[PDB]
Design a protein around this ligand. Structure first.
Ligand SMILES: [Mg+2]
Ligand SMILES: [Mg+2]
Ligand SMILES: [Mg+2]
Ligand SMILES: [Mg+2]
Ligand SMILES: [Mg+2]
Ligand SMILES: [Mg+2]
Ligand SMILES: [Mg+2]
Lengths: 113, 151, 261
RNA sequence: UGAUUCAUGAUAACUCGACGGAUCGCACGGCCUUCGUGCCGGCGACGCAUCAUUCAAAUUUCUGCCCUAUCAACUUUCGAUGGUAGGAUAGGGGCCUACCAUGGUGGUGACGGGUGACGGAGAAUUAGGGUUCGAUUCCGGAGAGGGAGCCUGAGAAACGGCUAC
RNA sequence: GAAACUGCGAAUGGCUCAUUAAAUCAGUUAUAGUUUGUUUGAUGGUACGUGCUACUCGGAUAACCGUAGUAAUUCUAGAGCU
């Protein structure tokens, strides 16, 4: 029996997203996982694609039952490809990460040619 | 001592080895960029007119054109020239390298020689656009200068 | 040190940028530009910190490299551009125009304007003198240079410039009795009518201005700026019509706004 | 302009003149003069030089710094203070040179010495006044083991640049 | 498009307080006594033809290929290319 209300809501068709702060009310429940927020927020806004959403920066206030966060309704998944930081696409599975070992990455490579 | 021969006429190069004084005596006491007749320097180099040019020694320090001493002297150099192409060396920088003199002498290791003798519509559009832009600039001159004049 | 300083630290930033203290070590460091660069606002402050169309440095970079953000008739993709006083910042995709003015407490507001009062800007002149071949030209505090000046336009004056004809259409002669608004110091933001102007040989000229409702003050010449001839301005003033109100008065406004609801 | 032989113009010349575009992108798209990518043409990228702006720098005016008189004279032949002429600098200037003058600072503390002394915003304590501190994340200066000298460059006497001791 | 040429930045950042007591520094001036890549804005005739409308297009160089010295280092000579 948990609800979801959003404020500070503003549209930017410079980057064509719908950016807002969400103020979920989740009493009794410990906290509501973002993967579960996704489909509710999709089914209220009728986005036709529950993947343009990206939600981040939650707190779960002292005393519990009330949590803040940011939400970004993109309108085109193409727009969310180009206009987005990589890390949270990687988080939602839309890109993958690689590991570094910085020796010879540039230094002893600068020596030969 | 060991000599590189390369040819510019064809484009092939190999290396050989001489160890006879009365052959290399006429190789000695020459500067860089002078021809040497190979008849004496080897019976199978008749007609071939070598040119001694370049070459280094052991300890790897080359000779440099213009320095006349059978010795390893230290010089302040400029990058990109002979004997110094210090890569990624902060253009304008100089180093004091060690070099050999220009006259061949005893302590060398390898000597380099060569042989002298073997025995759009886009562009058109840019031109005419430049012309048009300048000829409209001058009309702007004659328009607004006189417009200010008549006051 | 041994050259130009290319980093700016947040505490060293101008006080009217409003930007917080634990927000980082560095500030946008407005690039060299057409306005005094201590009296300016980077377009990154215009976008991220005021309008919030983005949330990061890189998202503001996306904003500007999209070529949407157009300033003063021509798009400026620099992310530290020193936009300042009566620069007009337009956005075609939002069809939305802004003009940058001081508000009475010494800071910068983005006052919306419609297209007709966004087709042109308004700026003061630094000085008018001759150039090569005897052609006169004048210099503005926006840096702009205009050749063949109207033989009456003189120094310290104000001039309107359209963004298509890109020249003068009219000019306010800086003189006694025309509405001004100070652009620097503690009196900055306050509009008012010049009531006196006294000159002392070899020093800054002092301008005594009266606000629309009785208060009087003084200012140096480099800080004042005529807007319109007479009392009427030729620009849309912000929500406070250029009257700086005493702290007691502004407390009463908020008390009355509380007791009205 | 507060103030100029200023801004600037005309003239006579002068330079072995730095310069005054042999550069690179797409989108094509009106119409035949020889119907011939044909007459053509826009939007940019870079770049040369001048002025202004800006980022600055470098000089620079006035007033202000701790203890010490068991530090009362210091400066000046070899730059001390000034003048003239010049040289050099981006530029003023003893910055330097030639000549001339005999000046400059001081009991209102110069010069000298100490500083376990970078300066400031400031820190601790505080009835008031004060006392002591401030290497340190903000600003300015100075150094990159100690000195000295230079290349490139708009910007360096650079040291995560070079040369010598 | 990797390598490379060219251009630009590396003169910022950062660290420390050794030297330095009208010196640096603070407040306040001044540059009409100066330089300033860049930004931004404006700006630019004659290159020779006896001022009577432009008149001609150069190789070499790196990366590459190849032969090498040096025990050696973004040490280093030479040939062939573009
Ligand atoms: Mg520094
Ligand atoms: Mg002199
Ligand atoms: Mg000390
Ligand atoms: Mg510091
Ligand atoms: Mg240094
Ligand atoms: Mg040094
Ligand atoms: Mg180091």
């Amino acid at each position: 029996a948990v609800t979801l209300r959003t404020r500070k809501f503003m549209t930017n068709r410079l980057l064509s997203r719908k950016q807002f702060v969400l103020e979920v009310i989740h009493p009794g429940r410990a906290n509501v996982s973002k993967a579960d927020l996704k489909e509710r927020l999709a089914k209220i806004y009728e986005v036709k694609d529950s993947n343009c959403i990206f939600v981040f920066k939650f707190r779960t206030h002292f005393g519990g039952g009330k949590s803040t966060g940011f939400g970004l309704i993109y309108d085109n998944l193409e727009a969310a490809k180009k206009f987005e930081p990589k890390y949270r696409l990687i988080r939602n599975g839309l890109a993958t990460k690689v590991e570094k070992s910085r020796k010879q990455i540039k230094e002893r490579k600068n020596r030969t040619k | 001592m060991k000599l590189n021969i390369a040819n510019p006429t064809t484009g092939c190069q190999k290396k050989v080895e001489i160890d006879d004084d009365m052959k290399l005596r006429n190789l000695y006491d020459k500067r860089i960029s002078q021809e040497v007749v190979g008849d004496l320097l080897g019976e199978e180099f008749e007609g071939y007119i070598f040119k001694i040019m370049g070459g280094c020694d052991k300890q790897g320090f080359p000779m440099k054109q213009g320095v006349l001493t059978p010795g390893r002297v230290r010089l302040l150099l400029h990058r990109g020239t002979s004997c110094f192409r210090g890569h990624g060396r902060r253009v304008g920088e100089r180093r004091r390298k060690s070099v050999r003199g220009c006259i061949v002498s005893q302590d060398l290791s390898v000597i380099n020689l060569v042989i002298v003798k073997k025995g759009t519509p886009l562009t058109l559009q840019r031109k005419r656009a430049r012309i048009a832009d300048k000829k409209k600039r001058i009309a702007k001159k004659k328009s607004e200068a006189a417009e200010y004049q008549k006051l | 040190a041994r050259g130009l300083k290319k980093h700016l630290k947040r505490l060293n930033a101008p006080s009217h940028w409003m930007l917080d203290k634990l927000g980082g070590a560095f500030a946008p460091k407005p690039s060299s530009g057409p306005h005094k660069a201590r009296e300016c606002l980077p377009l990154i402050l215009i976008l991220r910190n005021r309008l919030k169309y983005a949330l990061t440095y890189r998202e503001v970079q996306s904003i500007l490299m999209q070529r949407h953000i157009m300033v003063d008739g021509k798009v400026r993709t620099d992310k530290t551009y020193p936009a300042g006083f009566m620069d007009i910042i337009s956005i075609p995709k939002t069809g939305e125009n802004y003009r940058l003015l001081y508000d009475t407490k010494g800071r910068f507001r983005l006052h919306s304007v419609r297209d007709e009062d966004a087709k042109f800007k308004l700026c003061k002149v630094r000085s008018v003198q001759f150039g090569q071949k005897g052609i006169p030209y004048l210099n503005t505090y926006d840096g702009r240079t205009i050749r063949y000046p109207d033989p009456l336009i003189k120094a310290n004056d104000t001039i309107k410039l359209d963004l298509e004809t890109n020249k003068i259409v009219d000019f306010i002669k800086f003189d006694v009795g025309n509405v001004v608004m100070v652009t620097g110091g503690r009196n900055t933001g306050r509009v008012g009518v010049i009531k006196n102007r006294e000159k002392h040989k070899g020093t800054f000229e002092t301008i005594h201005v009266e606000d629309a409702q009785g208060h009087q003050f003084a200012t140096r010449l480099g800080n004042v700026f005529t807007i319109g001839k007479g009392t009427k301005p030729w620009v849309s003033l912000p929500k406070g019509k250029g009257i700086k109100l005493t702290i007691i008065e502004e407390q009463r406004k908020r008390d009355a706004a509380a007791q009205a609801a």
